[PDB]
Design a protein around this nucleic acid. Structure first.
Lengths: 359, 479, 445, 60, 331, 102
RNA sequence: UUGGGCUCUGUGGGUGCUUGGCCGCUGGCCAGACCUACUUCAAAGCCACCGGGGGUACCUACCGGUUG
RNA sequence: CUGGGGCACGCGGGUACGCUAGCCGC
C-alpha cells in the first residue's frame, strides 16, 4: 500500500473540490444554519444576511471600513480563493488574519458570527487559515459557536499543535481549560502559538480583556505545570531544563514585560515571571535581569503591582544587593515608603528594602 | 467596406464548419431540385454562420507563456517558478509519485481525464483517481506486465500480461483473462468503434470487440515484429511501426496494409498522431524524428535530429508535443500549424523536463488539464505546461466530471451509438457516396494497331477459338 | 508570461443549485464520426419504429350481423360515426364510449348501399328500396324515418354538401339527382344526356364547393357542375373504376379507385396524363379516402389489405391487415387525420392508426425532439440497402404475397412481349410513350 | 451501466459487458474458486494437458 | 431538469449582438467573457425549478443596466449603428418566462408594467395590464393604475371601461370607488379647463350605488366627502357637496362624521376676503357640533386632525391661530 | 478621465471589479576603494557560466565594477536578502552565552 | 542508583567487497549553456505458444484455376 | 394579423416640462 499512503498524503494536501459530492459537502459545511438548507443555499442571500451583520458590526466599531472596501464587497461575492496565485493568496491571507485580530474582541455576538459565516462560506477560512481562526476562537472554549466551529473543521487540517481536540471532535462537547492547559504543559508548542497570536494582538493594539485574562490563566497554569515537572532533583538536569524553559518563554515574556501600550499584558507578564521566580529556584542573575526589564517597562497604572513583583523578585533573590538602574527607577517611584508599607502589610518586602539601601 | 468583416466571417465559417467545399447551384438544370437545393445551401450557410456566432461562448482561456525580454527563452523556464507563477488550483495538480523498487513505470490517462493507470513492468498495476488523490485499485500482479490502458471509462482497464491479455473491473476484480491474443506487446483501444486492437510479437493483429466480444479481424501483418503502435483517433485507424523502419497504416477491412510510409532506415522507435486528424510524428532508431501529413502522405520539412533515438512521443491536444528520449524529454510548440500550407523547422523548442538520471519510460498528456505525465524508471510524475490540452470542451462528447447519472447515461448512449466495424477507411466520412462500378452497371442496364499485338500475344496461350480473336486475326491480316 | 487553463468544477455545478451545467463546444476537432454516427442513429431509429410499429387500436361495438357494406363518418363533429350493415340495419357509435352503441335501427330490405349525416344533425340511408332520413340524437328515440324517396331507381350512393343543405344521390340508371333540404322533392336530374351506364359513387368536392364528379361503368368518369346544371367531361380509361374522390386541399387534384388495382391521381383541368399511378395491389381496390391533410390516402382493397399512402410515392408506404378481416370495404379517415376507420366484410368497425409507429398523446419536449430526429435521419438516409430493406420489410399474408409475385412475373412477361413487338416491329421508329401518358385511353366531351 | 429499458435491451441482445462466448461460462473462474488455485495460468496448464489426454483417448 | 439545453437556446439567442459588440471596440475580450459568464449563471438560476421572483427581478435589473451602460459607452464612443432592440427583446423574454412561472407576485407585475411604461411599448403595456388584471381581480391598486394611465393618455372611455369593471368586481373596499370618483371629477375639471357634462351627474350616481354597496360605512362617506372636497374649483361642486351632505344627513343623522362634514362643508373652494368669513361660519358650525349630543371624543379627534392640517396651512392671523390652539387644548 | 461617476458605478455593478479588487488586495559610503577593478575587464559571452548574466546580447567585455555588480544581481537572484540583513535587558541576557554554562 | 514497565510508531545504519550526482562524455556541468543541423541510394529470407472432439452458411488465409 | 411592404427609434441647445410634442447638428 506504499503508493496508497503516498496518494493519501496528496489527498490530505488537496484543497479545491474535484467531484460533485465533495463539492456539495464542503459547500454545505456552515455555521449558522443546518446543512440541509446550506446545500440549497446560494451566495446571494448569504451575502445579504452576512452583509446585514457586517453593517451592524461596522456601526458598532469604526475600524471595519477597510474590509468594507476590500473583503465585504460585491466583488467579494464572486472571488473564489482557489483560482489565484500564491502571492495573491498570501495577501488575502494577511487580510484575513488582520480581520480576525480586528474581530476577536466582539466574538460572542450574532452579526460578528454572521461575518464569520461569510468568511467560511466564501473564503473557506476553516480550511485555509485553520491555525489563526482556531487560536482566535480558542479563548471561548465554553460557547456553542466554538462548538459548531469544532463541528465543521476538517480534521487533517487541524494544526499539529492543535490536534488535542480529537476526542471532542469524535464526541461534540466543549473541552475544558484543564485539557487545554494540560496540553500546554506537556506540549510547548500550543503555548507557543497562542503566545504568538496574543502578542500580535497587543502589537496591533487590538488586545481586549477577555483575551488577556484567558492568556493570563493559560501562561500561569502552563508554566506552573512546566516547573511542576521540570523539577527533577538532578542538579545539572534542573539547570539545563530551566535553560530550555527560558529559551521557550524568552521572546513572549520580554515582549510582554515591556509591552508599553498594553497594561493588561504587562500585568500578565508580571504574573508569569512572578510565578517563575517564586516557584522555580532560578539563578540571581536571571532574576535581576527580570527585574531590569520590568524596571525598564512599567507604567503608573501598573506601578503598585510591579512593586509586588519586585518584592517577589528580591525576596527570592539570594544576594543582598540590587544592580543599579533598578535603584534608579525606584528613586523615580513617587510614593515609595507608603506603597511599601501597604504591600508589606501582606508581602514581606524586607530583602527588597535591604537591596535598596545597599544600592 | 463594412461588409468586409461580414465576408471574412463567411470565409472563416465556411473554412471551419462548412464540412465540404460547397454545392454548385447554377449547374443545376431542374427547377424543383434547384429551388430546394437553394433553400438547403441557404440553411447550411446560416447554420455555419451561427456556428461561428456561437463560438464565443467558451468559458476558459487558452494557456500560454511568452518570453518578455530578448534574452528570455521559454525553454529556460523552471517549474518551481511556474509554481510561484500560477494558481493553487493547478499547484494542487503538479506532483511526483516515486515508486522505486518495481521497474520502469508505464502510465496512461483516462479518456475523460478522471483517472490514470500505472504499471511497473515487474509486476505492479494500480489505477488511481488523482485529483481527489484517491486510489480504487492496486494489485501487484507478479507476472511481468508488458502493457496497460483504460477501457471506455474508469469501470474497466486492460493489460498485456506475460502470456494473456486481461480485462479488470474497477475494484480490482479480474473480469476475464483472454487467451485469444497470445503474447501481446502492444495494445490499443479504438474508442468509438468499441474495439481492442492487439498486436503481438509474431506479427498477428487482432481487432476484438468488447461490447459483444467477437474478434472481428485477425491479420497476419507478414512483415516484422511491430516495434511500436498507436492509433489515429480521427480515422480510428492503426499507425504501427515496423523493424524495417517503415511505418504502416492499417484498417480492419483488408489483409493488406493500407498505407506503408517509409521513415528512418532502422526500426522506427515511436509514433504519435494528431487528434484533429492532420499529422503524425515518428522517431526512428536512426536518431532522427520527423513529421508527415496524412491526408497528403508527405514529409513537410527536413528531419529533426534527436540527441538520442526517442523512446516515446506524446503529442498534445493542440500543436504542442512532448518527445521523450532517453533520460530527459523535451516539448515543442508549433511543429505543424493547421493554416500554413507549408511548414517550418523551428530552431528552439518550447520547454523540457530535464535529465537527472530519470530515464523516461513513456509520456502522455491528460487530454483535459494542461499537465504532462512522465513515466520514468523511478516512478510517475506530472509537471505542468500551460499551453497543453484543449481549453473548452463539449460535455456532449466527454466530460471530465460526469456524475453517476451522466456516467450511466453516457455508457448507454455509447452503446446505442456503437459503430459497426466495417466502416473503417482512410477517408473517415465517406458514407453514402456512390459506387462507380455499380452505378455504371445501373446506368447501362437502364439505357440498354499497337495494343492488338499484345492482345494476340496474350490470347495465343488460351487457346479458345474465340470469334473475337477471329475478328482480331482478320484485322491483323488486313494490317 | 505564464498562464494556464484553470477550470474550477464550480463551472460544472454552481454552489446553491441542482443544475449540472453542461457547456458544449462545437469543434469538428472534438466531434468526429459525424456521418457514420448519425447513420447508426438512423439504423437504431428504423429498428425501434419496427419494434413499435403497432397499428391496431380497436374494434368498436359488437359488429354488424352480416358485414359492413356501408359506413360514413360525421366530418364536422369529431366522434360520431354511422355504420350500416349488409343486413339492412344501421347504427351509430360515439367514438369516446368505444364499447356500446349510440343509436340503432333497421333501414331497408336489401344491403344498404349508402349512408351519411346532414350538416345539422340528421342521418341518411340509401339502399335499393330507397332513400331515407332519420334523426339519431333525438332525446326520445324513434325508429321511423322522417324523410323518404323511392323514385330514381336503385340509389347507388350519396354525396353531401360541405356547408349547406345540398345532397346528391347517384343512381344506377346513368343518372344523378340533387336535392336541397327543406326546399325540394325530386331534385334536379342531371346526366350525360344520352347515357344509361351505371353510376357507382359521387363525392362532393370540398375545395371548390358546388362541384360534382362521378364514376361510370364505361371504365369512365364524369365531372359535373351545379351552377351550370350539366355534366362537364367524360374520360374513358383502360379498365373500370370503383370510387371517386377529390383532394380536400388541392382543388384541381382528384383521385379515382380503380379495378386496375390502381389509385390514379388525375387533375381536372388536364386529363392528358395521370398525375400519379399507384400500382399497389393484387385484388381490386374497394375504397379510397383522402386524408384531410391532403397529404395522405387510404386505399382499401377488396382483399385483406389496407395500404396507406402519401400523395407522391407511386408505391406502398404501408400495408395493414389482420386475418380477422377478409375483405375490407369502407375505409375512411377521422378528423385528426391520425386515425382511420375500417369497415370490414367480417362485420367489424376497426379504429386503426396512420404512420403506424407514432404513439400519440402529449409528449415531452425531448421526446418529440427524438422522434422528429428519427424522422430527419431516416429522411436523409432513406436509400441505403441496409436501412432500406429493414424499412420496406413488412409482413405479408401468404396468398397475397404469392399473388404479388404472380403479378410481377406476369406483367414482366407482358412488358417483355411488348418490347419484343416494338423492337421487331415498325414501332422502333417512334417515341416510347411514358406510362402516365399511356394511363388514359381517351377523353370525351 | 444502468439496466437497459425495453428498446435498449431489445436492440443489444448480443451485447453483454460481463461474459463473452469466449469465456465458457468462466470455467476457469469456477475451478479456481472451488479449489483455491493461485495461477489461472496453472488452470490453463491443466486444461491443455487434459485436452491432450482426451484427444489421445479419441484416437485410442 | 433540462436547464442546460434551454439555457443553450437562450445563450445562442444572446450571441450575435455580443459578436457585434466585440467587432466594435466598445467592449473587450475579457469584458465580454465576464458578461457571457454572468449571463449564463443568471439564466441558469432563473430557469432553476426551485425559483423566486426576487431573483427574477435581479436578472431583470441586470439586463436593464446592461442596456444602460452599453448606451452610455456608445454615446461616449460616438457610435450610431448599434441599437437597444435585442436587449429589449431578451428583457421581454425574461419577463415573459417570469410571468408564466409566477402568477402570484404583484410586485413583479408592477415592475414589468413600469419597465414597459418607460420603454414606450404602448399596445403591449395595455395587453399586459389586461392579462394581469384578469389574473388578480382583487387589487384596487391594479384597477386604479389601469384607469389612471388611461385617463392620463386621454382614452376616457377605456378609462371608464377599466374603472367600471373594477367597480363591478372589487366590492369590499371603497378605495377604488374614491379614486374613480376622483378621476371622474378630474375629467370633469379637464373639461372645464378645455372650456351630461353640464350636469356632471356621474359622481352623484356612483354615490347612489355606493349608498347600498357592501362596504357602506359612515367614515367611508366621510372620505367620499373628502375626495369630493378636493379640487372644489368647478361648476356643480356646490351641487354635489349639498347632495352628499343631505344624503348622509338623511341616513346617518347623529354621526360624528356627519357633524364633521357639517363643520367642513362650506370650505369647498377656499384658500383673500372669502377665507375668514367662511372660517367664522364653519366655526359657528363647529361650536354647534361641539355642543350637540354626539360622540364628543370621536368628533374632537376628527377636528384635531383637521385642525392640525389647518395649522399646517400657513398664512393666517395669530389671533385665529391662538383661538384654534385654545379650542384644541380644551378637548 | 472622460468617464462619468455613475458610469463607472455601473461598470463596478454589472461588469465586475476584478482589477481594482486585486488592487485592494495589493494595497553607507564604501570606505576603501580599489583601482584594479576598473583596470580589469572580463569576456561575458566567452564565459559560459557568466553567459546568462547579461542584459542585452551586446555585453561581452565588461569592466570589473559592473561585473561585480552583475555578480551581486546573480547572487541576490539566487538568494533573496534576509530580514536580519534589513538595548533591552533580557534581550541582552538572551544574547549573552555566559548565561549558559555547565 | 535522584522514578520504572509493557506495547506501538518514526529515523539512520547494516542486514553481499570500502571507485562520483548529472549530460546530448577521449569532453563538459553543477548559477550552466548551445539549441534543428546534415544528407547518398528502403528493406535478405525463415520462425512465431491460442484447451479437445465436432460443423462450416459468411469472413479471413493457402492452393489450384477464370474474365480483364 | 410572425400576411407582406413603407416611416421613425441615439446626445445638444431651442419652441416646451411635477412631462415630451416640434427646428437644426453631433
Amino acid at each position: 500500500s506504499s503508493l496508497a499512503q503516498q496518494l493519501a498524503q496528496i489527498a490530505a494536501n488537496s484543497r479545491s473540490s474535484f467531484n460533485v459530492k465533495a463539492l456539495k459537502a464542503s459547500h454545505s459545511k456552515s455555521l449558522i444554519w443546518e446543512p440541509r438548507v446550506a446545500v440549497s443555499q446560494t451566495f446571494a442571500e448569504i451575502y445579504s444576511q452576512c452583509y446585514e451583520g457586517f453593517k451592524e458590526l461596522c456601526h458598532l466599531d469604526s475600524r471595519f471600513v477597510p474590509f468594507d472596501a476590500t473583503l465585504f464587497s460585491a466583488q467579494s461575492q464572486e472571488v473564489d480563493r482557489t483560482q489565484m496565485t500564491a502571492e495573491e493568496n498570501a495577501a488575502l491571507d494577511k487580510r484575513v488574519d488582520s480581520f480576525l485580530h480586528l474581530v476577536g474582541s466582539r466574538l460572542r455576538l450574532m452579526p460578528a458570527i454572521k461575518a464569520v459565516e461569510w468568511l467560511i462560506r466564501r473564503f473557506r477560512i476553516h480550511e485555509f487559515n485553520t491555525g489563526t481562526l482556531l487560536a482566535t476562537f480558542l479563548p471561548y472554549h465554553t460557547i456553542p459557536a466554538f462548538v459548531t466551529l469544532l463541528s465543521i473543521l476538517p480534521v487533517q487540517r487541524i494544526p499539529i499543535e492543535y490536534r488535542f481536540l480529537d476526542p471532542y471532535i469524535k464526541s461534540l462537547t466543549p473541552p475544558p481549560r484543564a485539557a487545554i492547559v494540560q496540553q500546554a504543559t506537556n506540549r510547548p508548542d500550543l503555548l507557543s502559538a497562542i503566545s504568538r497570536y496574543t502578542l500580535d494582538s497587543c502589537r496591533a493594539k487590538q488586545e481586549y480583556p477577555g483575551l488577556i485574562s484567558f492568556w493570563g490563566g493559560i501562561m500561569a497554569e502552563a508554566v506552573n505545570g512546566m516547573i511542576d515537572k521540570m523539577r527533577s532533583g538532578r542538579r545539572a538536569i534542573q539547570l539545563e531544563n530551566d535553560h530550555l524553559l527560558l529559551q521557550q518563554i524568552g521572546p513572549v515574556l520580554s515582549e510582554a514585560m515591556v509591552m508599553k501600550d498594553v497594561p493588561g499584558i504587562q500585568i500578565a507578564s508580571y504574573m508569569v515571571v512572578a510565578i517563575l521566580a517564586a516557584k522555580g529556584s532560578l539563578n540571581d542573575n536571571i532574576l535581576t535581569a527580570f527585574m531590569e526589564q520590568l524596571v525598564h517597562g512599567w507604567t503608573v497604572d501598573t506601578l503598585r503591582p510591579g512593586l509586588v513583583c519586585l518584592t517577589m523578585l528580591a525576596q527570592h533573590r539570594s544576594a543582598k544587593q540590587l544592580s543599579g538602574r533598578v535603584a534608579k527607577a525606584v528613586i523615580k517611584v513617587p510614593d515609595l515608603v507608603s506603597s511599601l508599607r501597604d504591600i508589606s502589610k501582606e508581602h514581606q518586602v524586607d530583602k527588597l528594602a535591604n537591596g535598596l539601601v545597599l544600592a | 467596406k463594412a461588409e468586409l468583416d461580414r465576408i471574412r466571417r463567411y470565409k472563416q465559417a465556411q473554412k471551419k464548419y462548412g464540412r465540404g467545399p460547397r454545392v454548385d447551384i447554377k449547374s443545376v438544370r431542374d427547377k424543383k431540385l434547384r429551388r430546394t437545393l437553394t433553400n438547403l445551401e441557404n440553411k447550411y450557410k446560416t447554420a455555419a454562420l451561427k456556428a461561428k456566432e456561437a463560438e464565443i461562448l467558451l468559458e476558459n482561456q487558452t494557456g500560454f507563456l511568452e518570453p518578455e525580454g530578448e534574452l528570455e527563452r521559454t525553454y529556460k523556464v523552471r517549474q518551481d517558478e511556474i509554481v510561484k507563477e500560477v494558481a493553487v488550483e493547478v499547484a494542487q495538480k503538479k506532483f511526483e509519485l516515486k515508486l522505486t523498487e518495481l521497474g520502469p513505470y508505464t502510465c496512461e490517462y483516462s479518456r475523460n481525464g478522471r483517472d490514470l493507470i500505472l504499471a511497473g513492468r515487474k509486476g505492479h498495476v494500480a489505477t488511481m483517481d488523482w485529483r481527489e488523490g484517491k486510489l480504487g485499485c492496486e494489485l501487484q500482479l507478479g507476472e511481468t506486465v508488458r502493457d496497460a490502458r483504460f477501457l471506455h471509462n474508469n469501470q474497466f482497464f486492460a493489460v498485456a500480461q506475460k502470456k494473456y491479455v486481461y480485462i479488470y473491473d474497477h475494484n480490482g476484480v479480474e473480469i476475464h483473462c483472454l487467451r485469444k491474443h497470445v503474447e501481446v506487446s502492444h495494445m490499443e483501444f479504438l474508442p468509438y468503434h468499441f474495439l481492442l486492437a492487439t498486436l503481438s510479437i509474431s506479427g498477428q493483429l487482432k481487432y476484438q470487440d468488447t461490447s459483444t466480444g467477437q474478434i472481428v479481424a485477425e491479420i497476419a501483418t507478414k512483415h516484422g515484429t511491430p516495434v511500436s503502435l498507436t492509433q489515429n483517433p480521427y480515422n480510428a485507424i492503426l499507425h504501427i511501426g515496423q523493424q524495417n523502419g517503415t511505418v504502416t497504416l492499417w484498417s480492419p477491412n483488408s489483409t493488406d496494409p493500407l498505407v506503408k510510409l517509409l521513415a528512418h532506415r532502422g526500426p522506427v522507435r515511436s509514433l504519435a498522431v494528431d487528434r484533429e486528424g492532420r499529422y503524425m510524428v515518428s522517431t526512428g532508431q536512426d536518431n532522427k524524428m520527423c513529421i508527415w501529413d496524412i491526408r497528403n502522405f508527405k514529409e513537410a520539412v527536413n528531419s529533426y535530429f534527436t540527441r538520442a533515438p526517442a523512446t516515446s512521443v506524446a503529442i498534445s491536444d493542440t500543436g504542442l508535443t512532448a518527445v521523450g528520449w532517453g533520460t530527459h524529454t523535451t516539448i515543442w510548440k508549433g511543429l505543424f500549424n493547421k493554416e500554413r500550407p507549408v511548414q517550418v523547422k523551428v530552431d528552439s523548442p518550447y520547454m523540457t523536463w530535464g535529465g537527472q538520471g530519470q530515464v523516461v519510460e513513456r509520456v502522455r498528456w491528460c487530454p483535459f488539464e494542461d499537465i504532462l505525465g512522465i513515466g520514468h524508471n523511478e516512478g510517475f510524475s506530472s509537471i505542468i505546461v500551460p499551453g497543453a490540452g484543449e481549453a473548452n470542451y463539449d460535455a456532449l462528447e466527454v466530460n471530465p466530471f460526469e456524475t453517476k447519472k451522466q456516467r450511466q447515461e453516457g455508457e448507454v448512449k455509447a452503446l446505442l451509438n456503437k459503430l459497426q466495424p466495417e466502416m473503417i477507411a482512410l477517408d473517415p466520412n465517406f458514407i453514402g457516396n456512390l459506387d462507380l462500378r455499380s452505378e455504371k452497371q445501373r446506368q447501362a442496364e437502364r439505357d440498354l494497331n499497337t495494343a492488338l499485338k499484345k492482345y494476340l500475344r496474350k490470347q495465343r496461350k488460351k487457346n479458345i477459338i474465340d470469334e473475337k480473336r477471329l475478328k482480331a486475326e482478320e484485322l491483323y491480316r488486313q494490317m | 508570461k505564464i498562464k494556464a487553463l484553470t477550470r474550477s468544477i464550480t463551472a460544472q455545478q454552481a454552489p446553491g443549485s441542482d443544475v449540472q451545467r453542461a457547456p458544449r463546444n462545437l469543434a469538428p476537432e472534438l466531434h468526429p464520426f459525424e456521418r457514420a454516427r448519425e447513420y447508426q442513429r438512423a439504423l437504431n431509429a428504423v429498428k425501434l419504429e419496427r419494434m413499435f410499429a403497432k397499428p391496431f387500436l380497436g374494434q368498436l361495438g359488437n359488429g354488424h350481423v352480416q358485414g359492413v357494406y356501408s359506413m360514413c363518418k360525421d366530418k364536422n363533429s369529431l366522434n360520431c360515426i354511422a355504420s350500416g350493415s349488409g343486413d339492412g340495419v344501421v347504427k351509430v357509435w360515439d367514438l369516446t364510449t368505444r364499447d356500446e352503441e349510440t343509436w340503432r335501427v333497421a333501414a331497408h330490405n336489401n344491403i344498404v348501399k349508402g349512408l351519411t349525416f346532414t350538416n345539422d344533425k340528421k342521418l341518411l340511408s340509401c339502399a335499393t328500396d330507397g332513400i331515407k332520413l332519420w334523426d339519431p340524437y333525438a332525446s326520445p328515440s324513434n325508429t321511423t324515418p322522417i324523410a323518404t324517396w323511392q323514385e330514381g331507381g336503385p340509389y347507388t350512393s350519396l354525396s353531401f354538401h360541405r356547408s349547406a343543405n345540398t345532397f346528391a344521390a347517384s343512381s344506377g340508371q346513368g343518372c344523378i339527382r340533387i336535392w336541397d333540404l327543406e326546399h325540394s322533392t325530386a331534385g334536379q336530374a342531371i346526366q350525360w344526356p344520352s347515357f344509361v351506364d351505371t353510376i357507382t359513387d359521387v363525392c362532393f368536392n370540398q375545395v371548390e364547393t358546388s362541384v360534382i364528379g362521378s364514376v361510370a361503368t364505361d371504365r369512365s368518369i364524369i365531372l359535373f357542375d351545379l351552377r351550370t346544371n350539366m355534366p362537364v367531361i367524360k374520360t374513358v380509361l383502360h379498365f373500370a373504376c370503383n370510387r371517386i374522390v377529390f383532394n380536400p386541399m388541392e382543388a384541381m387534384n382528384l383521385a379515382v379507385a380503380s379495378e386496375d388495382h390502381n389509385i390514379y391521381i388525375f387533375d381536372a383541368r388536364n386529363f392528358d396524363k395521370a398525375l400519379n399511378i399507384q400500382k399497389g395491389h393484387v385484388a381490386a381496390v374497394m375504397d379510397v379516402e383522402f386524408s384531410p391533410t391532403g397529404e395522405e390516402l387510404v386505399s382499401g382493397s377488396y382483399d385483406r389489405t389496407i395500404r396507406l399512402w402519401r400523395r407522391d410515392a407511386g408505391h406502398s408506404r404501408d400495408v395493414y391487415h389482420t386475418k380477422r378481416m377478409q375483405r375490407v370495404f369502407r375505409t375512411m379517415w377521422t378528423m385528426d387525420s391520425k386515425y382511420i376507420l375500417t369497415g370490414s366484410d367480417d362485420g367489424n368497425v376497426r379504429l386503426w392508426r396512420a404512420n403506424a409507429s407514432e404513439r400519440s398523446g402529449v409528449k415531452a419536449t425531448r421526446q418529440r425532439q427524438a422522434l422528429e430526429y428519427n424522422n430527419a435521419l431516416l429522411d436523409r438516409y432513406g436509400h441505403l440497402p441496409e436501412i432500406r430493406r429493414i424499412r420496406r420489410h413488412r409482413h405479408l399474408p401468404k396468398v397475397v404475397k404469392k399473388a404479388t409475385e404472380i403479378k410481377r412475373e406476369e406483367l414482366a412477361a407482358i412488358k417483355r412481349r411488348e418490347e419484343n413487338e416494338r423492337k421487331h416491329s415498325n414501332k422502333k421508329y417512334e417515341k416510347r410513350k411514358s406510362e402516365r401518358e399511356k394511363a388514359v385511353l381517351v377523353k370525351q366531351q | 451501466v444502468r439496466k437497459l429499458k425495453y428498446h435498449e435491451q431489445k436492440l443489444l441482445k448480443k451485447h453483454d459487458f460481463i461474459n463473452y462466448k469466449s469465456d465458457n461460462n468462466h470455467r476457469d473462474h469456477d475451478v479456481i474458486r472451488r479449489y483455491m488455485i493461485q495461477k489461472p495460468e496453472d488452470y490453463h496448464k491443466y486444461n491443455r494437458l487434459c485436452g491432450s489426454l482426451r484427444q489421445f483417448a479419441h484416437r485410442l | 431538469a433540462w436547464v442546460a439545453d434551454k439555457a443553450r437556446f437562450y445563450l445562442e439567442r444572446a450571441a450575435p449582438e455580443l459578436r457585434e459588440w466585440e467587432e466594435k471596440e466598445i467592449f473587450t475580450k475579457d469584458e465580454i467573457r465576464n458578461l457571457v459568464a454572468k449571463r449564463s449563471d443568471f439564466e441558469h438560476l432563473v430557469l432553476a425549478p426551485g425559483t423566486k421572483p426576487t431573483d427574477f427581478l435581479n436578472y431583470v435589473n441586470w439586463e436593464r443596466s446592461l442596456d444602460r451602460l452599453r448606451a452610455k459607452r456608445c454615446a461616449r464612443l460616438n457610435i450610431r449603428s448599434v441599437t437597444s432592440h435585442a436587449s429589449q427583446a431578451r428583457t421581454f423574454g425574461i419577463f415573459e418566462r417570469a410571468v408564466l412561472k409566477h402568477p402570484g407576485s404583484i410586485e413583479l407585475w408592477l415592475a414589468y408594467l413600469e419597465f414597459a411604461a418607460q420603454v414606450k411599448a404602448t399596445k403591449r403595456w395595455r395587453r399586459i395590464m389586461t392579462r394581469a388584471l384578469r389574473l388578480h381581480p382583487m387589487n384596487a391598486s391594479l384597477w386604479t393604475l389601469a384607469g389612471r394611465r388611461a385617463a392620463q393618455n386621454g382614452d376616457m372611455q377605456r378609462a371608464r371601461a377599466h374603472f367600471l369593471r373594477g367597480c363591478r368586481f372589487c366590492t369590499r373596499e371603497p378605495t377604488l370607488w374614491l379614486e374613480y370618483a376622483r378621476c371622474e371629477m378630474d375629467w370633469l375639471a379637464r373639461m372645464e379647463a378645455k372650456k351630461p357634462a353640464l350636469s356632471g351627474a356621474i359622481p352623484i350616481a356612483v354615490f347612489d350605488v355606493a349608498r347600498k354597496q357592501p362596504f357602506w360605512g359612515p367614515a367611508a362617506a366621510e372620505k367620499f366627502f373628502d375626495v369630493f372636497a378636493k379640487f372644489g374649483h368647478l361648476s356643480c361642486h356646490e351641487r354635489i357637496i349639498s347632495h352628499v351632505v343631505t344624503t348622509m344627513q338623511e341616513l346617518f343623522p347623529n354621526h360624528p362624521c356627519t357633524w364633521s362634514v357639517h363643520i367642513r362643508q362650506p370650505l369647498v373652494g377656499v384658500d383673500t376676503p372669502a377665507f375668514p368669513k367662511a372660517l367664522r361660519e364653519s366655526l359657528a358650525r363647529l361650536k354647534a357640533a361641539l355642543q350637540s349630543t354626539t360622540d364628543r371624543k370621536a368628533l374632537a379627534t376628527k377636528m384635531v386632525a383637521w385642525m392640525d392640517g389647518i395649522l399646517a396651512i400657513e398664512k393666517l392671523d395669530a389671533a385665529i391661530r391662538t383661538v384654534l390652539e385654545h379650542t384644541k387644548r380644551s378637548l | 478621465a472622460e468617464k462619468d461617476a455613475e458610469e463607472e458605478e455601473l461598470e463596478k455593478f454589472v461588469l465586475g471589479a476584478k482589477e481594482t479588487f486585486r488592487e485592494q488586495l495589493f494595497r553607507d559610503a564604501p570606505a576603501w576603494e580599489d583601482s584594479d577593478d576598473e583596470r580589469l575587464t572580463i569576456s561575458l559571452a566567452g564565459a559560459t557560466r557568466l553567459r546568462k548574466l547579461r542584459i542585452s546580447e551586446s555585453e561581452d567585455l565588461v569592466s570589473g565594477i559592473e561585473y561585480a555588480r552583475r555578480l551581486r544581481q546573480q547572487y541576490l537572484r539566487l538568494y533573496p536578502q534576509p530580514d536580519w540583513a534589513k538595548p533591552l535587558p533580557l534581550d541582552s541576557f538572551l544574547r549573552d552565552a555566559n548565561s549558559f554554562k555547565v
